[PDB]
Amino acid sequence: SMNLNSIPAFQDNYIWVLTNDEGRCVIVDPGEAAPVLKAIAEHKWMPEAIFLTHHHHDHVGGVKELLQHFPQMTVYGPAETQDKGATHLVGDGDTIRVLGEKFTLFATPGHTLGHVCYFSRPYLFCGDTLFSGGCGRLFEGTPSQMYQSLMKINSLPDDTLICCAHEYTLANIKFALSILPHDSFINEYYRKVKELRVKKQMTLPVILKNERKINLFLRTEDIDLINEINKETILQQPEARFAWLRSKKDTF
Ligand SMILES: [Fe+3]
Ligand SMILES: [Fe+3]
Numbered sequence: 001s002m003n004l005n006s007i008p009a010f011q012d013n014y015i016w017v018l019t020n021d022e023g024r025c026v027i028v029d030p031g032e033a034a035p036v037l038k039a040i041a042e043h044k045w046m047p048e049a050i051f052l053t054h055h056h057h058d059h060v061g062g063v064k065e066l067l068q069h070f071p072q073m074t075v076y077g078p079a080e081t082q083d084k085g086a087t088h089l090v091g092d093g094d095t096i097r098v099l100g101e102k103f104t105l106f107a108t109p110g111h112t113l114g115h116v117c118y119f120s121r122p123y124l125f126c127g128d129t130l131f132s133g134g135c136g137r138l139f140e141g142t143p144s145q146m147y148q149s150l151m152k153i154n155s156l157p158d159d160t161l162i163c164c165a166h167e168y169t170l171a172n173i174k175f176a177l178s179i180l181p182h183d184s185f186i187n188e189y190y191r192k193v194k195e196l197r198v199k200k201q202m203t204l205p206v207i208l209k210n211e212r213k214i215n216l217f218l219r220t221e222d223i224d225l226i227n228e229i230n231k232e233t234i235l236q237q238p239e240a241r242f243a244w245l246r247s248k249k250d251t252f
């Protein structure tokens with residue numbers, strides 16, 4: 001049984017921390033060490049590991065210093081984080097025992113080529129692959145890769161807690177409303193998210209069952225979304241419509 005905490009970092013990052021009953025924690029994508037060190041001290045956590053989802057600085061920046069403080073830790077990460085301090089390279093389909101729990105790794109290329117997600121039901125650490133109401137910008141991968149990646153995530157159980165790295169939800173939903181302005185779910189979510197954000201409260205994590213109702217990038221096969229896209233371009237291939245939506249989001 002694990003409990004979830006978050007530590008804000010930089011401007012809109014969250015460093016997720018999962019802790020077991022023994023107070024042992026895994027720290028996910030620590031872009032900044034200081035807030036994590038402070039949190040560890042506050043919670044009297046005993047760090048066991050860091051999970052890295054991808055190589056971006058806002059996810060890995062704090063690794064070296066955290067390792068300096070807690071040399072007992074293993075830093076799990078994909079090959080693309082090997083030079084960012086990963087001490088245990090993880091690949092697609094790997095299972096690892098952390099905090100006494102089993103985490104499944106799956107590759108979710110798109111945002112970066114080597115991006116991975118960590119899943120230990122219900123927790124999904126999906127870094128910058130999926131955001132609430134959105135998905136990672138495709139810095140390295142193709143729309144096809146991200147689409148595949150999103151389908152992998154979407155295949156997870158309804159109760160999956162989406163613990164993505166960024167407070168992008170409000171902007172994501174504003175984008176969503178530019179596509180389906182009258183969508184009941186998205187509008188409801190916009191309302192909820194606006195109130196959280198105005199109160200300076202985080203919008204994460206979110207439950208996948210709900211997330212897929214409001215995330216256009218998880219609604220590629222939704223009739224309503226298809227009908228909307230059809231108003232401007234006819235794209236039979238889901239990857240193409242996902243790509244279209246992603247392109248729209250790129251410039252929104
Ligand atoms: Fe990133
Ligand atoms: Fe990021």
